[PDB]
Amino acid sequence: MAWLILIIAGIFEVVWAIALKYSNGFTRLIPSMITLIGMLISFYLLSQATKTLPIGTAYAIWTGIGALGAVICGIIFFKEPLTALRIVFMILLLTGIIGLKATS
Amino acid sequence: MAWLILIIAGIFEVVWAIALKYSNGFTRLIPSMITLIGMLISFYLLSQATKTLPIGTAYAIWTGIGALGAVICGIIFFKEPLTALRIVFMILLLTGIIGLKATS
Amino acid sequence: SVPTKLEVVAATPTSLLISWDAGHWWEWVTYYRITYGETGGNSPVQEFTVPGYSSTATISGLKPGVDYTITVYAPTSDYGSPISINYRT
Amino acid sequence: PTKLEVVAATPTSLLISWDAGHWWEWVTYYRITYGETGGNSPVQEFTVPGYSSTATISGLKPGVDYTITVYAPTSDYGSPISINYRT
């Protein structure tokens, strides 16, 4: 369960990360709202997951889901350049996450 | 000097990570309080160093300090597991994170 | 681009109920700032703000018979030009 | 928490206080419930931020015996404190 909460927290991490830039100086309502919500959810879920999971693993996997989703969305919705370097980095990230969950 | 405030933002990242661990799911006041203030220090200190510096290297070093210090202070403070598999997959996850942030 | 269509919905010798067109959902701002003052030349205007989800605003405490200028601003100059009207109470 | 006193009281309201502890025992919010000591109904409940050690129960019927309890966020702390009191 705590791992599923971590996954969802990273998802919301990237949602509020993108909604932040879609807000202006925190001045576009609908983006800003989404940022404020996505934050409050994300961190809350993090605070829940950290109750049962070690803080290093939890922080790392939360950050990693955030970054992996950030790059996935950047490529797909932002015309971002897809390097083979980026592919090997994504592979390293997923390998780390999966192995960490498998060494529980 | 903008490098140094980036280092300090990365340190406050670890600070609020450890405080969030201590807050037992955001229930113990003071850890929670340390978690919230230490957050927007880190988020603020970053945006300043991010002004001078390249966003990629800045984010890579920021989350690198954050995650590595989280793992280290976790195995220290909370006697979190120090396995060879855990350090290996943590290395993989952190290198993937740092690489994806050094690119984008 | 925002806001649009500033007009006095209702009016009384002392109060004016004004409204505007916040725009499309992607144009909605987090707040508007409203400024009302004697259309003459006394610079201490009166000012307040309104949450971005509100499209109307009431304005009390006006001297009867005077002509006031009323301005609505978005948070930043990004979104458009501030719009303003004149009205005698 | 501990030490649930009724600081002040009028016919229609009580002022209550409790000992939070110090520093590490503090919590982010306390939860105060209150209701007629007998008579079913439900109970009323509200929540106060964990930095304040006082609370104000209002809108009570005069002469009735209410019961008031204060809860920490979880049971992993210092157990729920409870008192009775007539207005």
Numbering used by the authors:
A (entry chain B), B (entry chain A): 1 to 104
C (entry chain C): 4 to 92
D (entry chain D): 6 to 92
Would you copy out the relevant sentences from the publication that reported this structure?
Upon optimization, we obtained crystals of Gdx-Clo in complex with one of the monobodies, termed Clo-L10, that diffracted to 3.5 Å Bragg spacing, and we solved the structure with phases determined by single-wavelength anomalous diffraction (SAD) of selenomethionine-substituted samples. The monobodies primarily use residues diversified in the library to bind to residues 24−32 from loop 1 of each Gdx-Clo subunit in slightly different orientations, each forming a ~400 Å2 interface. A large aqueous chamber is open to one side of the membrane, with the strictly conserved substrate- and proton-binding glutamates, E13A and E13B, accessible at the bottom. Positive density is visible between the E13 sidechains, but cannot be definitively assigned as Gdm+ at this resolution. Inspection of the regions that change in accessibility during the transport cycle shows that, for each TM3, only one of the two GxxxAxxxG packing motifs is buried at one time, and that burial alternates with conformational exchange. On the open side of the transporter, several charged amino acids, K21A from loop 1A and E80A and R86A from loop 3A, are solvent-exposed in the aqueous chamber. Upon conformational exchange, K21A, E80A, and R86A, converge on loop 2B and the N-terminal end of helix 3B, forming cross-subunit H-bond interactions with the backbone and sidechain atoms of L53B-T57B. The hydrophobic loop 1A also contributes to sealing the binding pocket on the closed side of the transporter, where it is wedged between the antiparallel helices 2B and 2A.
The other group was characterized more recently, and encompasses guanidinium (Gdm+)/H+ antiporters (Gdx proteins; E. coli gene name sugE). The two 4-TM helix subunits of Gdx-Clo are arranged antiparallel with respect to each other in non-equivalent “A” and “B” conformations.
